[PDB]
Design a protein around this ligand. Structure first.
Ligand SMILES: OC[C@@H]1O[C@@H](O[C@@H]2[C@@H](O)[C@H](O[C@@H]3CO[C@H](O)[C@H](O)[C@H]3O)OC[C@H]2O)[C@H](O)[C@H]1O
Ligand code: CL
Ligand code: MG
Length: 346
């Protein structure tokens, strides 16, 4: 499978939802063991999913994920310690809406990281310590984290994670950093935190790509720029959106319309071909820069369980991954295998 074909290049990973990570699906257990040598929990280690609004913890799904990776001897990436999404407003705010102090939030971060990264110390090889800190306007994202703590929210998150599990490979992770503008803003931020002595080992490019954009050349610039920071590059959340885009009026663009969901009956072969060529282009690039890249993780296993079916428009039928809704490999899968099977060396 993919993991074996790409053995000499990088890990091949998948994000697993809680149903998959339970181990109850024999067909996926088989598929995953064959294809992937790394996994990431799709949701269960996120603050607002793992904990309730009162801060109470429920380990069932997170433990099941770690048990699954241990059972199958898979490299495991924790996702994610500090992020502005899927986290209760109660972490940051009093019931009246007012923000708590920097000191009070720091205490909460310390408790969260110490507990979560501590539980799985030595079991998870890597952590997405901070996710999505640069805004799409290229300034620091105006989250509660940032408004209360400043850039110390990032510095302190990495410091704490490194104290709790000194052996973990600590990553900053973001989307659209394949693109000019955000790439450079991210480079500058990381540069300035590295200067301050922040422990950081890796840089995650999410890789939520469109069928057309961004071009390979922009992605290449990012691989090269982030590697120059002395960081290992990971592609963390790969998928290819094949459906009409709403990214380019502004307030109805997220509503369901049938014209924006044109493949409910199946993805036609011509689009299968385009999708296969797009993934092939991408993996050619990755192979080219295998010296800089530790991992390529897909944000799901099969198309039936992709988040892009419901984002950014609820209820669509998307086709973003390497396995179809019956778990059969798509044409894109075979193009990826052929890149390695037919590789030329001395
Ligand atoms: O519809 C219910 C549920 O939604 C899906 O999970 C979503 C995640 O996949 C999503 O992951 C983020 C994707 O963007 C970035 O890569 C980020 O780093 C990821 O955490 O987060 C929102 C979730 O709703 C599941 O597919 C499905 O069961
Ligand atoms: Cl899940
Ligand atoms: Mg282990």
């Amino acid at each position: 499978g993919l993991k074996s074909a790409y053995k000499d290049n990088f890990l091949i990973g998948a994000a697993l939802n809680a149903t998959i990570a339970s181990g109850a699906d024999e067909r996926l257990n088989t598929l995953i063991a064959k294809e992937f040598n790394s996994i990431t929990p799709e949701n269960c280690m996120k603050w607002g999913v793992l904990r309730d609004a009162q801060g109470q913890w429920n380990w069932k799904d997170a433990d099941a994920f770690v048990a699954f990776g241990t059972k199958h001897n898979l490299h495991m990436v924790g996702h994610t310690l500090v992020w502005h999404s899927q986290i209760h407003d109660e972490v940051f705010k009093n019931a009246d809406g007012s923000y708590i102090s920097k000191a009070a939030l720091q205490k909460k971060m310390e408790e969260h990281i110490t507990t979560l990264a501590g539980r799985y110390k030595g079991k998870l090889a890597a952590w997405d310590v901070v996710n999505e800190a640069v805004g799409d306007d290229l300034k620091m994202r105006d989250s509660h984290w940032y408004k209360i703590m400043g850039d110390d929210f990032i510095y302190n998150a990495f410091t704490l994670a490194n104290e709790v599990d000194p052996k973990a490979h600590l990553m900053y992770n973001d989307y659209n950093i394949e693109r000019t503008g955000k790439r450079e803003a991210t480079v500058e931020m990381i540069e300035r935190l590295q200067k301050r002595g922040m422990p950081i080992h890796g840089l995650g490019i999410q890789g939520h790509l469109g069928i057309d954009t961004p071009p390979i050349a922009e992605i290449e610039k990012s691989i090269i720029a982030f590697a120059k920071l002395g960081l290992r590059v990971h592609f963390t959340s790969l998928d290819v959106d094949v459906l009409p885009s709403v990214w380019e009026e502004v307030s109805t663009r997220f509503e369901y319309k049938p014209e924006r969901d044109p493949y409910t009956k199946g993805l036609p072969q011509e689009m299968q071909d385009k999708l296969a060529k797009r993934y092939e282009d991408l993996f050619k690039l990755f192979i080219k820069h295998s010296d800089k890249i530790d991992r390529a993780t897909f944000w799901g296993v099969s198309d039936d369980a992709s988040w892009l079916n419901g984002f950014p428009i609820p209820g669509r039928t998307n086709y973003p991954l390497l396995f179809d809704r019956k778990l059969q490999p798509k044409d894109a899968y075979f193009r990826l295998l052929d890149l390695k099977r037919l590789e030329h060396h001395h």
